[PDB]
Amino acid sequence: AWVDQTPRTATKETGESLTINCVLRDASFELKDTGWYRTKLGSTNEQSISIGGRYVETVNKGSKSFSLRISDLRVEDSGTYKCQAFYSLPLGDYNYSLLFRGEKGAGTALTVK
């Protein structure tokens, strides 16, 4: 399996939006959850993006697609963005399963100004 992440690079002006599209390709396991991460300009630390506000995610599990649209961009939003698939393994208990990290997109290098 692999995550097909587009676009690879983007340049936007402040105030514009970016849509990043991810598609889980040649899947073995069923897509359960998704995550979005960024290393912002000036920083070496990759951090999680909380979905909400300027950050709007749309997930279509049937087409194995998940997208992030970031509105009202500012120059500090510039950086590398990566999406990630998550899967689960069953357990012998509940209603309680085992979530685990899946494949990551290759990234989108965004430049804002």
Q: Where are the domains of the chain?
A: 1-113
Superfamily of domain 1-113, CATH level 4: Immunoglobulins (2.60.40.10)
Strands 79-89 and 65-70: unpaired
Tokens encoding 112: 């804002």
Q: How far apart are CA 103 and CA 113, in angstroms?
A: 31
Q: What are phi and psi of 75, to 5 degrees?
A: -70, -25
Phi, psi values for residue 49, rounded to 5° = -100, 125
Q: What resolution in angstrom units was achieved for this structure?
A: 2.2
Q: How far is CA 55 from the centre of its chain?
A: 11
